[PDB]
Enzyme design. Structure first.
Site, PDB file in Angstrom:
ATOM      1  CD  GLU A  52     -72.777  89.797  -3.780  1.00  5.53           C
ATOM      2  OE1 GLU A  52     -72.274  90.880  -4.179  1.00  5.53           O
ATOM      3  OE2 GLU A  52     -73.220  89.002  -4.641  1.00  5.53           O
ATOM      4  CB  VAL A  57     -70.095  94.453 -10.427  1.00  2.00           C
ATOM      5  CG1 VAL A  57     -71.049  95.650 -10.562  1.00  2.00           C
ATOM      6  CG2 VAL A  57     -68.618  94.783 -10.099  1.00  2.00           C
ATOM      7  CG  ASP A  84     -92.204  86.538   8.042  1.00  2.00           C
ATOM      8  OD1 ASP A  84     -91.959  85.521   7.347  1.00  2.00           O
ATOM      9  OD2 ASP A  84     -92.204  87.667   7.498  1.00  2.00           O
ATOM     10  CB  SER A 177     -88.638  90.564   2.531  1.00  2.00           C
ATOM     11  OG  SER A 177     -89.756  91.431   2.347  1.00  2.00           O
TER      12      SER A 177
HETATM   13 CA    CA Z   1     -70.827  91.662  -5.796  1.00  2.30          CA
END
Ligand code: CA
Length: 223
Positions: A52, A57, A84, A177
């Site tokens: 990504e 998009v 965590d 996070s």
């Molecule tokens: Ca994308």
């Protein structure tokens, strides 16, 4: 990310988005079938989004793979955020290229003064709300244990570190996070918590991945 810069498309090839109908957390690709995130990011019905840049998009380098299994650290404490860290296995192996790569696990713990790269799609404002569609990046030092424990009295454990700027202005924020903190090409941190964002004397607090390597390897070997 507050006070950072636009990384550029696929310049952080190990960066994952965790999607449940929407982006909710980041993560790191540590091999073709495994993602490491923050235990406080635990949800059912995760889809892992690789490759990504713009999360709104379809730009051509994406891989969307559902999670088969999620494993929260056996000692995760949601009240203290101690331990965590969470492991997510993909239903299928990712196709690794220059734009989608894994990040190495550390051999050693990084020390105070080391410059690291923190990235994510989180809120870019310290006051108010503004979420970017593209990946944001931040270069920040690891702070001393002393400065960390003095910023957050009684709250820092062995399994945490602080990174950022005591002056404020530059930090990770809500939505970042579970995302990476990478120092010298190794995964040293996971975006865990803080007291607000980019506030003076309140740096980001990160899960200290070097403490977990043995757990990670053992788990991956058996699952
Ligand atoms: Ca994308």
């Amino acid at each position: 990310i507050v006070g950072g810069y636009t990384c550029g498309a696929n310049t952080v090839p190990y960066q994952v988005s965790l999607n449940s109908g929407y982006h909710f957390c980041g993560g790191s690709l540590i091999n073709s079938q495994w993602v490491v995130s923050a235990a406080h990011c635990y949800k059912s019905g995760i889809q892992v989004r690789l490759g990504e840049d713009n999360i709104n998009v379809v730009e051509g380098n994406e891989q969307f793979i559902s999670a088969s299994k999620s494993i929260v650290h056996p000692s995760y404490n949601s009240n203290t955020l101690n331990n965590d860290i969470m492991l997510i296995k993909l239903k299928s192996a990712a196709s690794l290229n220059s734009r989608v790569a894994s990040i190495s696990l550390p051999t050693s713990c990084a020390s105070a003064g080391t410059q690291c790269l923190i990235s994510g799609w989180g809120n870019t404002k310290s006051s108010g709300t503004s979420y970017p569609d593209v990946l944001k990046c931040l270069k920040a030092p690891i702070l001393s244990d002393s400065s960390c424990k003095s910023a957050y009295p009684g709250q820092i454990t062995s399994n945490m570190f602080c990174a950022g700027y005591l002056e404020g202005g530059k930090d990770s924020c809500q939505g970042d996070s579970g995302g990476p903190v990478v120092c010298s090409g190794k995964l040293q941190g996971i975006v865990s918590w803080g007291s607000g964002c980019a506030q003076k004397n309140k740096p980001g607090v990160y899960t200290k991945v070097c403490n977990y390597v043995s757990w990670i390897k053992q788990t991956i070997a058996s699952n």
